Chains A and B, each alone.
With several copies, the nearest count.
Chain A
């Protein structure tokens, strides 16, 4: 992995956030170009 990109990123983010949900008031260049730890993955999600 370490790229968790495309149609896989949404599934991964839902699997890591099946209960609390995401946020609304960057995903690609942070999570697709390079490695992408669980830290920013939850940072995105509430």
Chain B
């Protein structure tokens, strides 16, 4: 068989080593494996502890304070699917006091998530791990505070007998331990796998295969598993847990076990055995099918009425949800594809009964693809329905040229958004105009230049040392608002210079009633190197009058 072993539930192991033997027979863990808080352990307690049966993890693997464990090359695994993550990460190693070397030479691929290896004062052979071949995205990896990071590791790969790859421009050998190297398949094999002879496996294998090009000899399937065969999709069988396919009988017994006794009454839709019917379909008692219900979505009642979204695993709880009877707080702190994953998990939300809150989300709010109504039954302190604070890199809320949103009740809030424009547009769209008080929207802490007007230079002359730059006057609808013009110029060796510089402040021209005798603002800057190109543009200043700005021109001095 493809997996000669059994299947086993998600387990938690603590305070002893008697429970670890439960891994004796199960080859694939449907769930997460946690080995944590093992204090009394010693290296003699792990000399003969081996689990060569385990091959694939579905959710993740968390290691936390297993005292006395030095290497995992004798304890364990080829793929960690990562359907459910542990704070964005599928492999968390935290405070492993005595771990010297990872030793997971049998691991090949992580389909979802990242890897964290933190606060390990004895760990080695990190730089000899090529994370690129394992994870599709590697910038999320967070490996600091280790003995390898202190440059105290004598990383001696076997041999040159181990494959070597180029990382950060350096050709370094890859090895897990002093006796095992990193199996690097040919690039043609992609993630299918390669044999000991390097032959690419069948298109449905994942990681490794006992035989090349055969769906019953792999070590782990790529899409789904059935009867010892790896198939792209399963023919009256139904998809289950995104990795294996079970018949109607299996899902039936699962449903019966939980009605006879947290547990989802599993349903069947689109030929998958999934834990709850999606939005807009209903629960058919006769055949467990999802039939299209008329009118009123998937209601997801948040616990305590408030939930904070701090990482991807928190966002996963709201998958498929449509109406959120509660309040949201967004406290994301960094990561890759955050727009992608947050959109994928939360793109189906349409209503928030409570208030929407954004705090310190350092890493646009477009991932709310269908958010349309915010009833605002529950308000933040001060009767606030939308609250946006300390959003360092927030730039856009929504594309109002296409998006629509309505706020039933409550005021808004935007302080300390250095790069956020759109606020007045939101006030117009959501019908909140005339509700915000003073200091509700901070005047200068927000956006500290969303110009929508283009300035045009009127006169240009050059010399070897002096250049005069002249442009068309600007006047806002309230001429008293115009504070001046800012002229920007620097050296520009190439024409790829962006607006993000030497700044010159220029007063507005004297206002004359004669358009023929109109005075145009200009400036003559000196000290310019001869035969040198500069990138130049001018910005207006006003006290919404968005002001005007000028394109980046390139001017060269005389020889």
State the A residues within 8 Å of B (CB): 3, 5-8, 10-11, 14, 18, 21-22, 24, 32-33
0/1 string, B2-13, CB within 8 A of A gives 1: 000000000010
- State whether A6 touches B480 (Cβ < 8 A): yes
CB of B555 to closest CB in A, whole Å: 35
Task: Tell me if B15 counts as interface (CB < 8 A to partner A).
Answer: yes
Q: Which residues of A are found within 8 Å of B426, using beta-carbon distances?
A: none
Task: Tell me if B511 counts as interface (CB < 8 A to partner A).
Answer: yes
Task: Tell me if B421 counts as interface (CB < 8 A to partner A).
Answer: no
Q: Which residues of A are found within 8 Å of B119, using beta-carbon distances?
A: 7
Task: Tell me if B37 counts as interface (CB < 8 A to partner A).
Answer: yes
Task: Tell me if B479 counts as interface (CB < 8 A to partner A).
Answer: yes
- By DSSP majority rule, is chain B's interface helix, strand, loop, or mixed? loop
- By DSSP majority rule, is chain A's interface helix, strand, loop, or mixed? loop
- State whether A3 touches B15 (Cβ < 8 A): no
List residues 110-134 of chain B with CB under 8 A from any CB of chain A: 119
30 A–B contact pairs at CB < 8 A?
A: A3-B477, A3-B478, A3-B479, A5-B478, A5-B479, A5-B480, A6-B478, A6-B480, A7-B95, A7-B119, A8-B479, A8-B511, A8-B513, A10-B37, A10-B65, A10-B95, A11-B513, A14-B39, A18-B39, A21-B14, A21-B15, A21-B16, A21-B37, A22-B14, A22-B15, A22-B37, A24-B12, A24-B14, A32-B478, A33-B478
CB of A7 to closest CB in B, whole Å: 8
Q: Which residues of A are found within 8 Å of B479, using beta-carbon distances?
A: 3, 5-6, 8
CB of A19 to closest CB in B, whole Å: 9
Known: A3-B479, A24-B12. 5 other contacts (CB 8 A): A7-B95, A8-B511, A10-B65, A11-B513, A22-B14
Q: Which residues of A are found within 8 Å of B12, using beta-carbon distances?
A: 24
Bound complex: CA A14 to CA B513 (Å)? 14
CB of A31 to closest CB in B, whole Å: 11
List residues 503-521 of chain B with CB under 8 A from any CB of chain A: 511, 513
The closest CB in chain B to the CB of A32 belongs to B478
Q: Which residues of B are found within 8 Å of A14, using beta-carbon distances?
A: 39
Bound complex: CA A25 to CA B398 (Å)? 42
Q: Which residues of B are found within 8 Å of A6, using beta-carbon distances?
A: 478-480
The closest CB in chain A to the CB of B67 belongs to A14
Bound complex: CA A18 to CA B511 (Å)? 22
